[PDB]
């Protein structure tokens, strides 16, 4: 299904793996998808998170508090966690329901909040961004793009 991801959404997934690697992590979790959405810096997901006061530094601090780093950066392919897999599956449905045949950054963010249970969701709530508020912000920004 990666064939349906936009270039920027693919870049987010590629960057999520490197967010994990540079933290000496051995799985790509939902929190690394969150970091990648912010760090790539251009798409509707990044805009939505910035506009809710969710910064890369806020997320990094919470990930260090909740997960912490390993001892060594791994080589090779880092596997997705069960919850990260669920996020990427759910992204497909978010896109279809919003009338898109492609999966953009916003749909990965929407999948992440739909899963709603893993480390990224915990971080967002801890940083003051309730899941319904994140969803409604994405909708609000998307509506502005229809002008």
């Amino acid at each position: 299904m990666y064939e349906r991801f936009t270039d920027r959404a693919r870049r987010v997934v590629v960057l999520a793996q490197e967010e994990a690697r540079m933290l000496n992590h051995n799985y790509i979790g939902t929190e690394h998808i969150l970091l990648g959405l912010i760090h790539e810096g251009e798409g509707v997901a990044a805009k939505s998170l910035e506009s809710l006061g969710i910064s890369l530094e806020g997320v990094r601090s919470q990930v260090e508090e909740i997960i912490g780093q390993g001892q060594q950066a791994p080589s090779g392919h880092i596997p997705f966690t069960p919850r990260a897999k669920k996020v990427l599956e759910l992204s497909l449905r978010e896109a279809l329901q919003l009338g898109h045949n492609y999966i953009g950054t916003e749909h990965i963010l929407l999948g992440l909040i739909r899963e709603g249970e893993g480390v990224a969701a915990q971080v967002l709530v801890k940083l003051g961004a309730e899941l319904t508020r994140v969803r409604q912000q994405v909708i609000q920004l998307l509506s502005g793009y229809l002008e």
Binding site: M1, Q17, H77, I78, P79, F80, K85, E89
Partner: peptide, 7 residues
């Protein structure tokens, strides 16, 4: 799809 980047 759906285990690694980008399978």
């Amino acid at each position: 799809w759906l285990a690694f980047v980008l399978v």
